[PDB]
Amino acid sequence: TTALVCDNGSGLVKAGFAGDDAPRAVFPSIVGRPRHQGVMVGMGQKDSYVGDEAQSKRGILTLKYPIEHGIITNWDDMEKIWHHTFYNELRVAPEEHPTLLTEAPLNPKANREKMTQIMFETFNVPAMYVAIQAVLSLYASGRTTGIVLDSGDGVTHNVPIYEGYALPHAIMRLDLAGRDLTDYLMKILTERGYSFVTTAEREIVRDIKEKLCYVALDFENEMATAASSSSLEKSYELPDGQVITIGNERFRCPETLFQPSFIGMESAGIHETTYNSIMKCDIDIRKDLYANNVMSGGTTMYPGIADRMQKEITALAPSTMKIKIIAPPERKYSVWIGGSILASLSTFQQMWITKQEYDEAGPSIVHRKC
Amino acid sequence: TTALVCDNGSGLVKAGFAGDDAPRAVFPSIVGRPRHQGVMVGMGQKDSYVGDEAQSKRGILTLKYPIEHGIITNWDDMEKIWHHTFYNELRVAPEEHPTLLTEAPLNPKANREKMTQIMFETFNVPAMYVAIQAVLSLYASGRTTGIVLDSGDGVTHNVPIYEGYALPHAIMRLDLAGRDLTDYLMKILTERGYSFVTTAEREIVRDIKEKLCYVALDFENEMATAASSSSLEKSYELPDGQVITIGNERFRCPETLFQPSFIGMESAGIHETTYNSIMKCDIDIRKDLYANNVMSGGTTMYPGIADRMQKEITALAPSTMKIKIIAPPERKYSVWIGGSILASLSTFQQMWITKQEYDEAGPSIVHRKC
Amino acid sequence: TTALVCDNGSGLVKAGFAGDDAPRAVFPSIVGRPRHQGVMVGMGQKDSYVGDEAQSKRGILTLKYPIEHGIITNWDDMEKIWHHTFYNELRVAPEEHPTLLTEAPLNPKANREKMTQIMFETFNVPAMYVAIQAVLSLYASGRTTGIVLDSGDGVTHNVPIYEGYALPHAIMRLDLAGRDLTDYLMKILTERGYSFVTTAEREIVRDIKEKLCYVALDFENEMATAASSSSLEKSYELPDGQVITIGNERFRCPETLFQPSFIGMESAGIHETTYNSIMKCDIDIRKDLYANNVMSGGTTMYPGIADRMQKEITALAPSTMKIKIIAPPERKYSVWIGGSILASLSTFQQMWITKQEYDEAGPSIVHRKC
Amino acid sequence: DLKGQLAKLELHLNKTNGQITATERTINYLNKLKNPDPKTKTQLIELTEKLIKLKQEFETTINSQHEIS
């Protein structure tokens, strides 16, 4: 049999089978509800569209996100997403195969229990397991000693591991991610005249973000160059056949990652969190973590993030130490690529939580290995 | 056949074959146990690392010393060390060859019996012998009349011999050794700001001690010179790419040997113990012992210890009488170099304790020659 | 004249006059800097608020602590705190009166010198003295033989004294204190959903700690009772009119004191350090130290700490020996109450360090009695 | 091949020197004796002969190693 490896994310859902190199299906995790009357007769009355069809018909829908900052807020919508993924998208009955899910570190306990109950009582899978998102990245990378820097939508976290002994006191968590960058892009695009308010307009701004953005190696010099000349300008086309012309905002959106004071937050940029995590471990292992940094998640695909990260860490860290930022391509799916590998391993095939085990022990079972 | 000559020490293990000039293998006598969870799958779990691999991975282990002050405290870990030495390190089955061990004088009786039992019932060596550490030094030195001053880690002892007639009432024993110096180094390095607490940090401090230390010919004048100028400063580099700068502490660590009141102890310095041992023998032999002094053990490798020892003894002892401190190089292995020689001697090949002798006579056998 | 007795602490400042029973003024040792723009006109442009007004307006400030782990990190802020204490809070010119300060044991030398210089060159007090925090506790307690266990914010130390002969080799120091408990409270409160990140939010968590916490007599049984039933639950109200409901975390925060492995630290709990300190003294005085233990500092106000301390020490120590934990009320100010008494004593009025003495001898003066 | 055989000659020379050192130490100890045990009287002669044999073997090995060079 093949064991599904679903990765319920904060901004996308990637579902596939074990022993593959890419998710079988990938689609946004949104639920759209109709807003208007409906005048024609004979058309099917849909209470709510889910998945990609909602993204197709965003004009007359009120799109909502069941997940936010990793935590799950709405449960009916999440169950609808899971049903759509299992039946309509993957087209495989869930009873036959086990399943593997991923949850970010330091999340509330209740989340795990509710997930388990919804995956046992309602869907009736024969076995389920849940894993920390950061850890699975190291299987995909191919090493055992490192400091992953998973940065998904919603939240970003750092988890240092050494010789396969995760240090739990050095783990760091932070609520700066792609959604805040999208909101800031809207707020700063307001200056030139372009006003985006509704949710679908936010979806458009998200596409604008994805296509036209980059991270400057140095910020003040880039601002001076953009102000003096007019070479840092790009033209994009809306669905309405209108042309936006973006200038400085190309590198003021991602810059909030390194300067969280733009949004009014107070925490330090991501480089400082990485450095603090490294310096919260023991003295003897700091060199190895320095040597092997790792990035994951979609948000770390901005052109030029690796160079700035290396420069900042090198400036912060002492000399005589060599810093490398392992930033392989296709990092977007890295987390998922871990899970499939973890499923394949023969040893891991003994660590599931069978249904009868949950029936007997109770909800606490999952937390024993937490 | 070749007879193993192992020297279970207090801070290092040296094991080799007879008729050689150096131990075949040398490695610290520590046992490290993992401290953290362990998150990766497949690595294969290990309960406890032993020997040099534990020193390699000190970051995530709780290093423990099975031996302390010569006495053996933990046995299940002392047996693990012996097994590692015989099989993994030396790579020779213990059944074929006999074995020779070394034990410091004035140690508890039970130690000897338990060592014998563990070396007969469990490992099944055909013959075992045990010798006093100080005596074996005199074979390496090449003389017969002298007063050895073996100072290993853990403890330091003096054993005067004359014409191969060891005087047992003049033997002296004292519990000042390298471990106390390491602790004092930590305590006094605290002043400049550098704080070392964990066991691995103690291991780092031990290296700091080994590399950068020396014994001043005179103490008050050296302190005055170090305070007035800034020439007695050295720079050392941690594993974390940080730079320590040591000043006076270079010669305040070993000075506790001659002034044990630094640690709160009350006994007299080592020169006074040597003088007392010499003046506790008969009148007619004091000149010969004064003439031929011997140093051994690692702790006596500080640059300048021989000169200060000679000066102090000359000041203490009467004039008209000549004092020399025989302090040959490679004194570190001196004790072991004795044992191999003792194994080689044809006469000594009649003095072992065969297995059947221990089976018949009982545990008391070993103590008959004590 | 009256001699001021300030006690610059790690988390609070207590300043008062000699011959009193309580500090004249007590206020937190923080410095807040504004974070936002400032739009209104006619107001007073303040670079930085200090003391209690900063605590009042924590909403829009970035609070910083000049002291940490006893050591002083930032000097400008510390000078600002001292100026605020002398002029605005106490309302007495510092030239007329001498002053007495307190510094924890085993701290770096440079600290003392810099403190002296800042208290002579800038403020111009006619005489200054500095004392060890633990020693002053014994004057307030009223005995001469004991083993103090001062545990302030920042650090905790043990100093055994016998017949007014402080043993310096038995002193112990450890970096576990209230700040680590506050951080652990944040980390474990994360589980139920309540996420506190900013500094003012940490200040709120500190109040939560102070009000609702206690130490269980035994830990496993308490966890079982809290899990089975729902009687160990308390409700607290934030400044935002929201209600937190705390359960187990009531007694998992202070438990870190007795099990430092929660934070990843490796040292032993406080009972083991007390036992080791007692067992590092001479044989003949251990009974007297066993009989008279003393606690000080704010951190030792958790309801039920005395009983657990007594139980653990009794279990560790041999029978036939009687253990009592002298834990008087109002222990919070105990250290300060010592200093005032020490100021009053007629003999002590000869031990100050006059200004001309420092001018002539130089900075080393203070260290002569160290 | 030349490099490998040169390395083997170097290893053999190192082993020979290691044997010489121990034999010299044992003879140095035995010389000081004044009324040795009858067994030690023969062992001293045996070691004295073995030292000479080892020294000529060392000379031959070094000569061969130089010749290859």
Ligand SMILES: Nc1ncnc2c1ncn2[C@@H]1O[C@H](COP(=O)(O)OP(=O)(O)O)[C@@H](O)[C@H]1O
């Ligand atoms: N090529 C890209 N360049 C810049 N940002 C991207 C890119 N691809 C995705 N993103 C950002 O990452 C987010 C998706 O992150 P995702 O990989 O789904 O994280 P998770 O898997 O944890 O949900 C999107 O909201 C988008 O803003």
Ligand SMILES: Nc1ncnc2c1ncn2[C@@H]1O[C@H](COP(=O)(O)OP(=O)(O)O)[C@@H](O)[C@H]1O
């Ligand atoms: N070169 C050196 N300089 C100073 N101290 C040394 C040196 N080498 C070893 N030591 C000290 O000696 C100790 C090791 O002693 P060792 O020779 O093992 O005695 P034993 O064999 O009785 O254990 C170490 O703890 C170390 O502190």
Ligand SMILES: Nc1ncnc2c1ncn2[C@@H]1O[C@H](COP(=O)(O)OP(=O)(O)O)[C@@H](O)[C@H]1O
């Ligand atoms: N009543 C209390 N209950 C529990 N903890 C307290 C209480 N009062 C103070 N604390 C803790 O003690 C700390 C203050 O310690 P303090 O007495 O100021 O030490 P110091 O005098 O060395 O600064 C605070 O951070 C707080 O967390």
Ligand SMILES: [Mg+2]
């Ligand atoms: Mg992701």
Ligand SMILES: [Mg+2]
């Ligand atoms: Mg030794």
Ligand SMILES: [Mg+2]
């Ligand atoms: Mg205090």
